Amino acid sequence: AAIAFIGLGQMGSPMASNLLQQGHQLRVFDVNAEAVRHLVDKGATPAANPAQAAKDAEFIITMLPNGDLVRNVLFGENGVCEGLSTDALVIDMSTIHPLQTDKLIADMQAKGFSMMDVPVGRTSANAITGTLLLLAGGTAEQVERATPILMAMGSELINAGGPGMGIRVKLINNYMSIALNALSAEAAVLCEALNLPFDVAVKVMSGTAAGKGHFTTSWPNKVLSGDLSPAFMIDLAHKDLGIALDVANQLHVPMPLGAASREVYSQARAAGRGRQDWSAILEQVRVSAGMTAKV
Amino acid sequence: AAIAFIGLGQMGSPMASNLLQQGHQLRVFDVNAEAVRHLVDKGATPAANPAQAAKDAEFIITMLPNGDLVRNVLFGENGVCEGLSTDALVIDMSTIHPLQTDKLIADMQAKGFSMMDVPVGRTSANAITGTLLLLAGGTAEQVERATPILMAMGSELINAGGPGMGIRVKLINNYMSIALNALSAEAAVLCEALNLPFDVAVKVMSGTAAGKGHFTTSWPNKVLSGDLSPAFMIDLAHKDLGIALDVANQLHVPMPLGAASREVYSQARAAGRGRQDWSAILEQVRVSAGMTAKV
Amino acid sequence: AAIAFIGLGQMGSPMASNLLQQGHQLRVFDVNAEAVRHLVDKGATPAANPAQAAKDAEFIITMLPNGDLVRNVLFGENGVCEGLSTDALVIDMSTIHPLQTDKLIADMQAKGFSMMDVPVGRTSANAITGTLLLLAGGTAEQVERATPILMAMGSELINAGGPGMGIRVKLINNYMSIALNALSAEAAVLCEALNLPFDVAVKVMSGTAAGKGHFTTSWPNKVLSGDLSPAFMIDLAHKDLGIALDVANQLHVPMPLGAASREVYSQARAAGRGRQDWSAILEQVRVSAGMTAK
Amino acid sequence: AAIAFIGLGQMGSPMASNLLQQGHQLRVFDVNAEAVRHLVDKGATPAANPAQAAKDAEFIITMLPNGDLVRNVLFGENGVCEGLSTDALVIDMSTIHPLQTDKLIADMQAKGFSMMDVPVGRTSANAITGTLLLLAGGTAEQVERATPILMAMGSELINAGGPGMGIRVKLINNYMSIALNALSAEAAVLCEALNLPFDVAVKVMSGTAAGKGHFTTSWPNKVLSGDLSPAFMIDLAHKDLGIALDVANQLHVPMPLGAASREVYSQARAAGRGRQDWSAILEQVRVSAGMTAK
Numbered sequence A, B: 001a002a003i004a005f006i007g008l009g010q011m012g013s014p015m016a017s018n019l020l021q022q023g024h025q026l027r028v029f030d031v032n033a034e035a036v037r038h039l040v041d042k043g044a045t046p047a048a049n050p051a052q053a054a055k056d057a058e059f060i061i062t063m064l065p066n067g068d069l070v071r072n073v074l075f076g077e078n079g080v081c082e083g084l085s086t087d088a089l090v091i092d093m094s095t096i097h098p099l100q101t102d103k104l105i106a107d108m109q110a111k112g113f114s115m116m117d118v119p120v121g122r123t124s125a126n127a128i129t130g131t132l133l134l135l136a137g138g139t140a141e142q143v144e145r146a147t148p149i150l151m152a153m154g155s156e157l158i159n160a161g162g163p164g165m166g167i168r169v170k171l172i173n174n175y176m177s178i179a180l181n182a183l184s185a186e187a188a189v190l191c192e193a194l195n196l197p198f199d200v201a202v203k204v205m206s207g208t209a210a211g212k213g214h215f216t217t218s219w220p221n222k223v224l225s226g227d228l229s230p231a232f233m234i235d236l237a238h239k240d241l242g243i244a245l246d247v248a249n250q251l252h253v254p255m256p257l258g259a260a261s262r263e264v265y266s267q268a269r270a271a272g273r274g275r276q277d278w279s280a281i282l283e284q285v286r287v288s289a290g291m292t293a294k295v
Numbered sequence C, D: 001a002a003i004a005f006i007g008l009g010q011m012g013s014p015m016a017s018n019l020l021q022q023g024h025q026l027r028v029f030d031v032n033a034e035a036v037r038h039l040v041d042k043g044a045t046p047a048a049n050p051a052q053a054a055k056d057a058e059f060i061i062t063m064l065p066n067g068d069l070v071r072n073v074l075f076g077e078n079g080v081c082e083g084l085s086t087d088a089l090v091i092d093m094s095t096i097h098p099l100q101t102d103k104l105i106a107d108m109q110a111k112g113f114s115m116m117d118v119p120v121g122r123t124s125a126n127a128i129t130g131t132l133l134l135l136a137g138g139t140a141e142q143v144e145r146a147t148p149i150l151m152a153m154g155s156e157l158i159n160a161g162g163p164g165m166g167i168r169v170k171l172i173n174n175y176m177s178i179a180l181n182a183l184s185a186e187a188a189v190l191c192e193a194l195n196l197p198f199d200v201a202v203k204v205m206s207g208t209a210a211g212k213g214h215f216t217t218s219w220p221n222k223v224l225s226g227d228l229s230p231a232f233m234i235d236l237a238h239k240d241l242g243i244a245l246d247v248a249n250q251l252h253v254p255m256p257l258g259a260a261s262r263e264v265y266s267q268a269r270a271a272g273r274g275r276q277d278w279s280a281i282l283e284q285v286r287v288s289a290g291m292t293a294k
């Protein structure tokens, strides 16, 4: 296929290189002339600006640091829009703010142009080998059309279920993993302060929600089924967390996420949830966010 | 075997019931006379106090709400110690402060008495069916001796590797799972506020550290191998967490654990770890706890 | 008066010394024999245990690290209760858990003994000079009776208004000041990271709730009067706190209290309080604590 | 003087009204035509856009919700820069990100234009009466030049000491007061849950760092003098904060700022500061922010 690729950085350059290896014709643009020359050496055609890159391209891929730069590349001076066909598909593979994604897609649709969000998971090492995780936003039609192109850059495609849903599922995944790392560290350092070998804690946690998560263990048959009858009461969870913070404070292991979590359980007790299943914390957070109670 | 059981509550009563079902002779005590009578009706003998329960018992099991009550039952007026044989073994199956466990074991040893910590995982439904997770503290000799008794009450025994290591691994496991529930709720409510179906997020998270945990994914080949070369840089993790909190604050989804987690990443940046792997957060927390850097 | 003093530490020793200086007869006990000897040299009588110290004393003062030790000294082996007259008054000047204070007072009353809570503010340098802040719990009768004794050890007495109210107001004051220190540090370090001289910030904050507090500025005529019509809207407070956290995160100034505070304002916005006065955060916290909205 | 005023909202409209009352000639712009009409009725000249407002103005005032809108009004389509004289002075009175202020000032200087930051303290009622607190950033020359104009809108001018220092001191002040409100609420609700009348707590706190602040009480003679010898040891502060959180958790009073504060004191203990004065928390936060220890 005829592809424009705009943004030839640590991720963009290996992604564009993989597309060339699968026999696509690339017109490439980057403000860094050296990044263009390295792709021309691999078989790309250089463009002077995004509009030139987009002329007669079927797919236009952006891989840029932020939503302001995506907006400039699409709508700015000699932007993609000036060279773009109504039949072409823009694929933004950038990780940007989800509401910026929505406004870019809407602003494109208003001019008769098609744009989808396919941000990626995993590292620049995965970008090189073509083993990225593709979190495919866009319509069902756009995902079907883009799939052959996307599978040149990644090894696994998740259909996120609509325009702007790729950037949203990347955000939820990364929020959870990045914050989980900080909590994981508190548990591991408290373990070391107690002179418990870490392997013993990992062995036990691998068989509980501690190591498997709540999403598929504690939650499905309780809160997610509308049943808050207790397996593990909020009062007992609150008590055990109190003991963990008493130990941490005695042993000078700072546990900011633990301390914050206990005040969430305290709010749940204040709201009358003490004798509910611990999965009711999901309902407490939904109500705290101004959502309508489901149970 | 001849067994004393002290504490016949939601967990203690079914645990004692399972020991009777396997043919042991139980002498039972609880301050709630009705809980005694329910076990006497199943073939237990009554005791008027802990000292009477312990007289001629080989194993003495306590299942009590907190370490002050365990101490009172062992050392208080008409306590276990007054009726206890030096050949007998005390098994505290309570979830109590682990340094209280250490002091109880030491105080017992000073009087010539043997005590081990075997707290349990899983809930009262599992107590009824005899399918508790047994987190066995104590010496190798104590665990070997107790095992036949313990397997009446639980279906799986983990040898925690020493005196006080059962209560330690119970605390680390529960700390992690209890706090993880609050973080899990933030991610799920932010997902709902973004109009992304939860099952799509769970499908993505099931393949990453978000759903599998860091302990066995991100950590083993990086921080735990002494390698902090970046797969996912702390600077990029910190940036993505900032976007997640910007979105949450726009959508009024309160995320106290996420907010606290970003200030931990900010401290890591301040400490010069921005270009290190995100698994370096473990080292940041260790150094924050006054421990010597390993990397 | 005849006084027993149990606990002769950094605070207890100078407090007992001031009572001797005002002409009281003290019987003193501490598990640290050297602390007893220092007071005996100043004219105290040594006692071998709390019961001996209490024998024929009119006032019994405890100044101890925690409520378990106060309980042991009153009710334990050779405890005060074994030497205590029903006409005597026990004064716990310790900072302990307020519900432990309530139970000690009740347990003493059950045995026919009178006990009050009079913890103190200010530090060991004030204990030496007799310039402590006296936070007097107890009945009006107990405060009247104790006052002449207490004014040997402190320069200002606040009548906290009942049994257990002294330890309650000590806890609220210390909670606020101890946590406020951590927040103050975040503001000061963000100030330094921005290259703004601290003196300029303190000059501005001295004229606003930042340096004067909300209790007597923002709150009285708004939330405390039942009026949540906005002077400074929660939405604008939330926005400005977002900017502060953006700056802190760009400059790697860790601000855990600020970060936590923004999620409280976020909860207030979710509850529909965005266009209310910022003093409505008090009502948000009351509702979050399961109290009936005012 | 000839003044352009862009942003005629809750603050901007009364500020522009006070400039008209003091005899200035105003050219006004707001995207809300009704807000323009209210000022035109008081004698302002309407402008169709920021460039038109700025034409022949000596002073150009912006009072806008955020730094993106300030940038759009100055540099965007029909922006101030298109109508601006190199002899004119731009005054941003908005509360925006201070590093955005620095970049706006620098971007203006690059085009030969002069810009200063003068955000305001106090509320819309003060904007109406002309009694705002003026937090004047800019060079000494710019503050001197702007002062006569500024004193039409505010009653008190603080010279913050340089370009970008007005927005920095506004941000430190608001950060502190906004976060302090949430901590104040936790102390007040714990007070209610303990059945202690709030006025008794306020009376005690008004005499301590709890109600007076640490900046001018605890800090000057200790950390700010390089003296960390203890008046109130970090270990004792950490212990008392533990008791307050135990009580709050027993009484289901959520205290997220208190909880976060205890983990900062815990970090201080881990770093070897347990036996230092509580004012050493400032040094702990500085070191946590990657600053060189004092």
Ligand SMILES: NC(=O)c1ccc[n+]([C@@H]2O[C@H](COP(=O)([O-])OP(=O)(O)OC[C@H]3O[C@@H](n4cnc5c(N)ncnc54)[C@H](O)[C@@H]3O)[C@@H](O)[C@H]2O)c1
Binding pocket: A006, A007, A008, A009, A010, A011, A012, A013, A029, A030, A031, A032, A035, A063, A064, A065, A066, A069, A072, A073, A093, A094, A095, A096, A120, A121, A122, A123, A124, B231, B232, B236
């Ligand atoms: N780096 C990772 O480990 C990783 C992992 C997964 C996803 N991501 C996402 O990938 C992106 C990071 O991209 P990267 O690492 O290639 O960044 P990079 O900074 O290395 O490359 C960005 C490129 O864009 C170019 N560019 C900037 N403005 C431009 C413009 N107006 N027109 C044309 N080119 C322009 C730059 O010259 C540069 O070559 C983010 O969106 C990030 O979240 C990163």
Ligand SMILES: NC(=O)c1ccc[n+]([C@@H]2O[C@H](COP(=O)([O-])OP(=O)(O)OC[C@H]3O[C@@H](n4cnc5c(N)ncnc54)[C@H](O)[C@@H]3O)[C@@H](O)[C@H]2O)c1
Binding pocket: A231, A232, A233, A236, B006, B007, B008, B009, B010, B011, B012, B013, B029, B030, B031, B032, B035, B063, B064, B065, B066, B069, B072, B073, B093, B094, B095, B096, B120, B121, B122, B123, B124
């Ligand atoms: N319930 C759960 O889901 C669960 C799960 C795992 C572990 N645990 C642990 O089990 C313990 C609590 O057990 P439970 O759930 O049966 O509690 P419970 O409150 O249902 O029962 C506690 C029993 O102890 C008795 N008791 C209290 N003081 C006593 C005394 N001085 N002497 C004798 N008896 C006394 C009470 O009367 C009561 O029958 C805790 O340590 C808890 O952490 C509970």
Ligand SMILES: NC(=O)c1ccc[n+]([C@@H]2O[C@H](COP(=O)([O-])OP(=O)(O)OC[C@H]3O[C@@H](n4cnc5c(N)ncnc54)[C@H](O)[C@@H]3O)[C@@H](O)[C@H]2O)c1
Binding pocket: C006, C007, C008, C009, C010, C011, C012, C013, C029, C030, C031, C032, C035, C063, C064, C065, C066, C069, C072, C073, C093, C094, C095, C096, C120, C121, C122, C123, C124, D231, D232, D233, D236
């Ligand atoms: N130190 C301060 O800055 C300060 C300020 C206000 C209030 N307080 C409160 O004062 C109380 C005591 O304070 P401190 O600074 O004097 O403590 P400290 O530890 O210096 O003194 C306590 C004394 O009690 C003695 N003691 C311990 N157990 C005893 C027992 N069973 N019988 C007799 N004596 C016993 C110890 O030997 C010691 O001398 C605490 O509640 C503390 O919070 C202290």
Ligand SMILES: NC(=O)c1ccc[n+]([C@@H]2O[C@H](COP(=O)([O-])OP(=O)(O)OC[C@H]3O[C@@H](n4cnc5c(N)ncnc54)[C@H](O)[C@@H]3O)[C@@H](O)[C@H]2O)c1
Binding pocket: C231, C232, C233, C236, D006, D007, D008, D009, D010, D011, D012, D013, D029, D030, D031, D032, D035, D063, D064, D065, D066, D069, D072, D073, D093, D094, D095, D096, D120, D121, D122, D123, D124
């Ligand atoms: N309201 C307060 O209590 C208070 C206190 C002190 C400081 N401030 C600061 O005052 C500033 C403005 O606040 P306000 O309360 O007057 O806000 P406001 O929302 O009431 O007014 C903003 C005005 O700007 C106008 N505007 C928006 N975009 C524009 C554009 N491109 N060109 C021209 N006009 C435009 C809007 O129509 C509106 O009239 C903010 O930075 C705020 O932080 C407010």
